[PDB]
């Protein structure tokens, strides 16, 4: 069936690696592990050996997006579908696969410009994870890391590629007027991916989302940011579609982190809807001075 | 056993009756009914014919606090216990009982100065209640109206009277330094009553609490206040003891209304604890310019 | 603890015995058994050998009301309480107890004039009951036969006697204006007994209630009455207090039978309420030509 | 509260010890352990070190009936109640208590003539019990060994003593005509004790009952008896009161063993009833040639 | 009812404070907090501000045992019972109560020589606890800290005092031959206290027990001890009575810590039993060279 | 769909047949039945007439591995897939099928050299199984006998054959460094088959696994081995992948038996992972003197 099961892992690029190394543990409550051999910050959020890398770079960027598949055959088969649509599929070397803490992966570049990695056999270590501060941990498992929201030059081209080629299913859309956002799922998590287009020629990422196991973690996280002078860009609130109670934290790279609890789950009787608003309540924009997103190209 | 079961109803006194008449429906989402014959605003929150009165008066005040008991015998018996401790017990006339929409009640005055009414056979009308705006209604039943927090001159005198005479059970205490608050229960609701003492000679009320059936009602209520220029005195947050996700709204009388969701319930294996803080997160004081409480006497 | 557990059985008196013999089976769906030696119609509704008698008499009357108690000691002890209040307690002979299909009973007369029988060890025959027509049977067990509603000259005298002496607990009251009805319980069944007073000097019964296991039995029963020319005095509807979906059937004796489904159950967190109406919906009076109740004395 | 909790253990006396030693294991599926020092057969049915003794004797007899109580104080207190009613209470020696595999016991003789032992701290050995043949084990725990049915000269004298003194509660009665049987409970097991009176001057026991965990064990047990020439005195069937699917096996002592599955459990809403029959179905008397009961005295 | 609810907290005395400070966090997985003003190590295991103290001293000793009660009245009332039996009851000063992180406590000395503290209103801080290593935390709540096993000169004197005066209930006994151990409960936890007597004139403690939320924590804890050269005195195994899967760790004071998972819970249908063995399996004595217990007096 | 459902049965070859005959019953707790006509030991573990054979032979060997399929058509169809890949498929004679206590089977030889039997209609006898010692029996049903772990010359050749031809699904891998193990499933049991390669030219088996219904059976089994001088080669512990609490017992043939409780179950949302370790805790190698595996060829 060669389907993407979940988001497996994520690679960020930033000059502000030392600031992210602290941010991940002190604010988000991820577990620091040792750096890569090249000086990237590395984090865990569950039994996986590593789900997030922050690599040194000249600009802020999405280095790579890791997706989970059952095994080699499913990643190969999906690869073939992608290859037929244009992008070159490349099998990772054994030494490359191990750097990503996976049994293996095929990778390719989006028509848009983002690197995706079709992985399997993610390395796990049971009962060794502990958060960077006293919070109740994260909701992963079958729903994976969480989700990422990307900004694309051409919403139809991008939308068609993610659905028709990569095989994501439409969750719902927000059409308020300013923005039109497409939400995609590959499991019970309301979305593993979403896309918007601020305008032509623009590429970037708005946020990644982590789910915590308690609402008090979301509230505490906001208070931790107020205490340690980390920008909260969006007050605690609830989205119209995913129904998740969340805040947005501004990271040392301009990418934001949605810190959320209690998302509505995708069921077999799930019908996509259209919303004219982003939020039911809250999500007040607290820092509109800051850059609205993490822009890669203009 | 002559025990208080729940808080049945509440009587407020204010000059700002017309402002409260609107506030109750437009902000809190109570159902307006017709005024009393004397021009008091009257509200429902469930199947009870009336749980809140706002009577005209020269100053802001707690007119009366209605408590629920099984029947006449239980209210009489509790009455006798109270009478032995000092306060005069008076049986309401039939016409008085009907004004309160109850079968009957005995009333008395606290040593402190608050009027309490031991009632039974509250008038109810099934399947006729609808909120003042689209919210999911209130959690009452065996837990009653909610709770009230009073300010008293002498915390030991007050505490002893509520527990030893009126027969409330201690839930827990907050001792941060500024304040020491006692929480009392008579059912599964974390507290139906709480008391604090800002200083000697002072009497007043801080807030009443209403429980709603959804967290989105709490969030929406805040946004409604921002929209209609009603002061929110405390941001969405969670108390250390009751664990309820709530905001505080400043009413046309200086009394505040805690609008909350999902309180921890009192069980048979419940042990009282001491807390050094009021809130786990949130509950940021947004309007410290306003009067801190509803003061009756200095 | 000597408490009444449920209503065990019922004795009706009527000249129209042959009409009742048919009515019980053809309309209510009770099981006919053989007559007493004296020509009374006898019915079952569950595993009990006999719960209803219809004895020959000159007028319509309540012959006796059977109550259930754990054993001899509990009936004796309750007897002593009653005896102290005025009524003579008499132990039934063995041959009398057997006519009632019970191990034994003490009996007495109400101050009002009704005969009550404190019984125990009711005769049962498992897996031999089948209804008089294809309906889903009756809800009895711990809730017993059902309930009876009596009319009394003096509501306070009657009320005080049933609660303070016989040890019934108040369920709720209806005070519309025309009538004031008291509802009493001794188990999970909303009420086993209720009383009203049309005026001074009047004694009678309005109805007995049977609970069926399906709503379709209530609906079918109405249609059976329309088919066989039996008066339905009250259309399908729902009471404000007991919340039961029911119709009232006019019996060959002027006593009515409430045929109902899905009554709200008395819990340990049960507070009595006051209602200003009898019904939430339905219960339209279809035959106000007929006598309003079964009057015994004027 | 000094109540009997369950039947703990049982002592039988018979000349046919070797026949019982085999019978217990091969037919009933009890676990043989080593004999007492004096040559009694000893069996387990659960984690208890020993629940049944078969002692050598000249005639068939009930040697002793062990009852379970919480501790020494409860057995002493019940002892005092018994002592006041006539029977001498004797504390067992340490060496006697150990022979019974209990921490200690007080014993006394019934007015009727049966020895009862009020015990506590029964010796148990976890996870070492295995049946004498492949059956699904026995239902004990809070319901204990099972029950015994005794025959008494004077049913009122016996009944009064078991209920008013030993503190058993009436479960129900069977009054067919031939026999009148009283059933008593001290826990969820429908009965732990029952009594009947064939005539004056007669004392004996009819049967003991063991509960198995599967109906197939009851059926298999019958077929085992047919195979090994052990008399089945009553075919598989179901009692009117206890509702248990059971057969009766004739033991090497004339005492019968009811081998049963799926008894109706005593609840807090349990009302005693009267039955005119012993069985709903089955329980066909297969061997009326054999002695009807185990008679001790005439 | 003035009953002890649970074990609240514990005070150990040892010269080896620095070794315990590390041991508590690195081996047991408790959370270190700041020392007392006098240099005692302090630990949390749940939301309580502090449940364990390790005070400096010349010898190894049990400094004090904290018990939980509902409030002041219950501790006072139990106090009065104790006072009548001999020991002096002393109310703690406010400053003393705060050192113990409780609202208040009465204390007294056992006839044996152990200090017990009847406390209430334990200080708690929600959602701030994190273990000293990645384990799944501890099972406390209504079952409290866990349990302690003391060694006493005179088992009857001690037993009588704990049950008849302090109001503990007997759980069960182990009588193998070498030892006779009494187990006492005051809640669902199989035991909060147990006592044994190696011989006359001897007083001490064998172990305290902590319950963890996963079996893997017990297994990991053993492997942590093997890694860091901490003596495991008893291999993973299961007790006959409490059924808990546990190991024993030898602490820097000679007191052992039972590290256990999945204890059988005390129910309302709980009967005390007698066992002839301590363990079903495991609990192999790995270090019989070490002192068998923590002896205070000879 | 022609899929393998479970492992049905197993055939071992050893010179030490008499030692295995005892070992199976006394240590593992299997039920002995009569030998084959040729003197093989035969065992049951559930309602199946026979799941394990130990045949006489000159060396230690895996005689045959029985797999379960729905019927003849599914075994034939899978046969055809296998036949196409190289191995000859042979239908068993009726007399051969009966020796295996199955309705019929096709058999073939692995490219590696192991004999596999595709069977159906396994002979069962309900309610006749009892363990060789007092343990709580085995978990089989839809998960079958358990699993076997084989050693192969060429891991890719073997892996490809089991997955692509026999139609097993990958469960997970352990890659520590010394070994790389592949785990395969065909049902809810974490694995029914696993393979490793010590080096080129080597063929053998490490262990078979039996699941018991209680953890105490695993613990008791270890203690039984210590008592009866049977080598335990691996202490109680928990694997990283299957999460089963188990010990390894060294059998009279060099094959080991994993005796385990409480394996994690394969779900529809199951993603294969990679582990860098075999065990979370325990599984200490107690007898490294013994041969590491059962080697068939070098
Ligand atoms: Fe998002
Ligand atoms: Fe409040
Ligand atoms: Fe009615
Ligand atoms: Fe019986
Ligand atoms: Fe212990
Ligand atoms: Fe294995």
Task: Explain what this protein looks like in three dimensions.
The structure is cut from a larger assembly and holds six copies of chain A (298 residues). Chain A has 298 residues and is α+β, with helices and mostly antiparallel strands. Helix content of chain A is 18%, strand content 35%. In chain A, strands 10, 11, 12, 13, 14, 15, 16, 17, 18, 19 and 20 form an eleven-stranded mixed β-sheet that branches. In chain A, strands 2-3-4-1-5-8-7-6 form an eight-stranded mixed β-sheet. Chains in contact: A-B, A-E, A-F, B-C, B-E, C-D, D-E, D-F, E-F. The interface between A and F is medium-sized, with 19 and 14 residues. β9 (122-123) of chain C pairs parallel with β18 of chain D, so a sheet runs across the interface. The complex binds fe (iii) ion (FE) (6 copies). The site of one fe (iii) ion (FE) has 5 residues of chain D, from β10 and β14.
Features of this protein?
part of a larger assembly; 6 chains; 298 residues; alpha+beta; 2,3-Dihydroxybiphenyl 1,2-Dioxygenase, domain 1; 2 domains; eight-stranded mixed β-sheet; 20 strands; binds fe (iii) ion
Alpha-carbon Rg of chain A, integer: 18 Å
Indicate the CATH class of the largest domain in chain A: Alpha Beta
Structural class of chain A: alpha+beta
The general outline of chain A is globular
Percentage of residues in helical conformation of chain A: 10-25%
The greatest inter-chain interface is formed by:
A-F, 19 and 14 residues
Beta content of chain A comes to: 25-35%
Termini gap of chain A: 38 Å
* The CATH fourth-level homologous superfamily of the largest domain in chain A: 2,3-Dihydroxybiphenyl 1,2-Dioxygenase, domain 1
What is the H/E string of chain A?
EHEEEEHEHEEEEHEEEEHEEEEEE
DSSP strand tally of chain A? 20
Largest sheet of chain A: 11 strands, mixed
The unique ligands bound to this protein are:
fe (iii) ion
Please, what is the oligomeric state? part of a larger assembly
Helix count of chain A? 5
CATH topology of the largest domain in chain A: 2,3-Dihydroxybiphenyl 1,2-Dioxygenase, domain 1
**What is the domain tally of chain A?**
2
Q: Just name the CATH architecture of the largest domain in chain A.
A: Roll
PDB class: oxidoreductase
Keywords: catechol, metalloproteins, oxidoreductase
Entry title: Crystal structure of BphC, a halotolerant catechol dioxygenase
Chains A, B, C, D, E, F: Extra-diol dioxygenase BphC
